[PDB]
Amino acid sequence: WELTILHTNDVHSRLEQTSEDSSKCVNASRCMGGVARLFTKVQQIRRAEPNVLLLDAGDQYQGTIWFTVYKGAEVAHFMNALRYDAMALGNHEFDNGVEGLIEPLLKEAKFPILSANIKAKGPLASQISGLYLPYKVLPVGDEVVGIVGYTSKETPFLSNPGTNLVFEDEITALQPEVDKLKTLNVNKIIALGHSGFEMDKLIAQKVRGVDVVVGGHSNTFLYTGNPPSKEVPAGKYPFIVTSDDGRKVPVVQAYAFGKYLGYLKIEFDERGNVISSHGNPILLNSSIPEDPSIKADINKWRIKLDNYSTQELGKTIVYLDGSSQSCRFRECNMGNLICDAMINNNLRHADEMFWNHVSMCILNGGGIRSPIDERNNGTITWENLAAVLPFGGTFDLVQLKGSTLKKAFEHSVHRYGQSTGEFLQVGGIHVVYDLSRKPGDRVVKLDVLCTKCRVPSYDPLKMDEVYKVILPNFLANGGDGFQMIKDELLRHDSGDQDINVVSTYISKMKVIYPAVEGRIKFS
Amino acid sequence: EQLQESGPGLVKPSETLSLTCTVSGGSIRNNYYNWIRQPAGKGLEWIGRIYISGTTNSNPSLKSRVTMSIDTSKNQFSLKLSSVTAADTAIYYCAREHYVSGTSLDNWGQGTLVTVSS
Amino acid sequence: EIVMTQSPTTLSLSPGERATLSCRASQSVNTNYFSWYQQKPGLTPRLLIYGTSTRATGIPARFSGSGSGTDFTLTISSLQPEDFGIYYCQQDYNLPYTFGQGTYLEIK
Ligand SMILES: *[C@@H]1O[C@H](CO)[C@@H](O[C@@H]2O[C@H](CO)[C@@H](O[C@H]3O[C@H](CO[C@H]4O[C@H](CO)[C@@H](O)[C@H](O)[C@@H]4O)[C@@H](O)[C@H](O[C@H]4O[C@H](CO)[C@@H](O)[C@H](O)[C@@H]4O)[C@@H]3O)[C@H](O)[C@H]2NC(C)=O)[C@H](O)[C@H]1NC(C)=O
Ligand SMILES: [Zn+2]
Ligand SMILES: [Zn+2]
The missing domain is CATH 3.60.21.10 (Metallo-dependent phosphatases)
Structure with a gap:
């Protein structure tokens, strides 16, 4: 039978x-x-x-x-x-x-x-x-x-x-x-x-x-x-x-x-x-x-549904470059926009303890699945945005030792040039890579935006200090080979859905114009 | 309808913890039975639930350290917490769901203050 | 986990006035899983409201539970001395269950 x-x-x-x-x-x-x-x-x-x-x-x-x-x-x-x-x-x-x-x-x-x-x-x-x-x-x-x-x-x-x-x-x-x-x-x-x-x-x-x-x-x-x-x-x-x-x-x-x-x-x-x-x-x-x-x-x-999906959420006056040839190789304005959204969302002040619980954001280039064109009278729709972020990941809050983040940034470029998704876009981080060094030793400058300060300014990462980072659930669970994150973190707190975060940011700002501004440099 | 918790008031750092909530108003019904704690001064923190059948979920913040148990021939529900620390000193409450809604926490116990210190 | 941000942290009003306490959830909570606790600094917390809106046995009509989606409200209309201490919102829609930071209410 x-x-x-x-x-x-x-x-x-x-x-x-x-x-x-x-x-x-x-x-x-x-x-x-x-x-x-x-x-x-x-x-x-x-x-x-x-x-x-x-x-x-x-x-x-x-x-x-x-x-x-x-x-x-x-x-x-x-x-x-x-x-x-x-x-x-x-x-x-x-x-x-x-x-x-x-x-x-x-x-x-x-x-x-x-x-x-x-x-x-x-x-x-x-x-x-x-x-x-x-x-x-x-x-x-x-x-x-x-x-x-x-x-x-x-x-x-x-x-x-x-x-x-x-x-x-x-x-x-x-x-x-x-x-x-x-x-x-x-x-x-x-x-x-x-x-x-x-x-x-x-x-x-x-x-x-x-x-x-x-x-x-x-x-x-x-x-x-x-x-x-x-x-x-x-x-x-x-x-x-x-x-x-x-x-x-x-x-x-x-x-x-x-x-x-x-x-x-x-x-x-x-x-x-x-x-x-x-x-x-x-x-x-x-x-x-x-x-x-x-x-x-x-x-x-x-x-x-066409009503709903072609609903204007806000305007951009710039090409939002979430193309893989940009976001897996260099600093891209789409990456900057998503990380700036991530930090904007997670706002908790304490008078004498920190300006914000979180100053720092990383995101794998692979997660950014599309550009958005600005020529449609500047309109950003849900559909347009769905195309950048199709998969409903959450942006989570983790605590990592400096040394763990050092290792994450080494992994970001350990096989640079080959269009892999692990290459990190950032907020509240200035990194410099020397690609002519050996893998595990290409991070020549890592500066992070302080939290234990009233005026936010950039300081060199410390290996034995603990930092709060927002990153995709994917990185939290060791996706794209980030095992050092999954294995070494000290707290994990689960956050809001990727697209919701990016959506509210665009609707609150009404008009965005993210630039490439030197968060990531090469010798 | 009343829930008293048995279990001592003193704990070493890196050590165990037997807490046993006793119901004797009526009996353990078809309901989730909870443990909660509060660091002294600050706010309420959910530990875990157990249904009659033995099923248990606990807080992912504490996940590796919680075990819970239930017995209907005994008529109460136990808690165990491994590997204790400064940030674990706190008042420990047993509680059960409102019996109309099968939601909320209705008929709490006195509590017991626990301390980490040598 | 669903974060419960209650505001304000501390209210000081006179007896006979109206205390409106506000709790905001990071995710939508089905109104069947939202509840309010009273506690006197020391002793067992007592259930006020289950569902968003249903009084528990022994709780007087002063207490009006309200709201839906993200934004929940606990209105006390004519405040009396024994209405002192801390008030927490609670969700059991998602695990873990989560309580708010608490709202501290002194009578002027
Ligand atoms: C939807 O999915 C379907 C299932 O995958 C697709 O059907 C498949 O299409 C592929 C691509 O055309 C087919 O792959 C191979 O077969 C073709 C046809 O070729 C001939 O030469 C073979 C020599 O061995 C003969 O054995 C055949 O009988 C036939 O005469 C080959 O030309 C391809 O191969 C060449 O490239 C391969 C690389 O893998 C080299 O190894 C070889 O050197 C060779 O030169 C493919 O091997 C496949 O047959 C077909 N699958 C089935 C089950 O029928 C369909 O294309 C897709 N639809 C759309 C719209 O994309
Ligand atoms: Zn699935
Ligand atoms: Zn599934």
């Missing part, structure tokens, strides 16, 4: 086709994903194979103007139009609270929504009763398949589920729901969930009776072959786990942003044992046409 599992995860509100870098679509022929194209590929597989399930493993909520304006009404409408068979709750499904999960998603979705490890209590227990499920018995042809869902234990930190939900251990909560399906004479069982690849592997290993694991949260690309785009696989598709009972359990994920359709074909025997499994995420590129009905519907919802 043969099943075809189609799966998406972490689509993150990418309802329209994107660029290859999952931002806004400029050249039609180089564009990818979107529900209209996903509909085309799904219809075609459903016309070719008898036993097809379309599963989502959470994080449909949050990512574009779509989610901000329609608040998950768009998720219900366009997942309903695609006849998804089941969805597991992600952490971002709680971003507008359990209230904002119920009101559009759980009430308008025609498909089952699953989490075996989220328990409801208080007056929410009656209000949410039956709207999400521990497990689902799905008829597929003349057989049944059980689904059990699971959601990251960490959702109560990562999002806003409130006090009336309990996120219990996935393994402990999953096992009794799998046992229940076995007592209902269900011999084929899929764990569909949103805790990441490391947890997906442990579920496959430890939960007796799970045949297959379909996953999200870690944006993990698994591919068997020469990769068709820029995503480097963490391993082969599917990833086989030997369970403690000696079973081979396929584990799958499909990256993020609706760029790939996961595709897994399983042969089961009569008793529900997995005999064989093969597949590969399908790259959804311009060689699959957008379905014309879904596209016309997308266009309909688009009309009310």
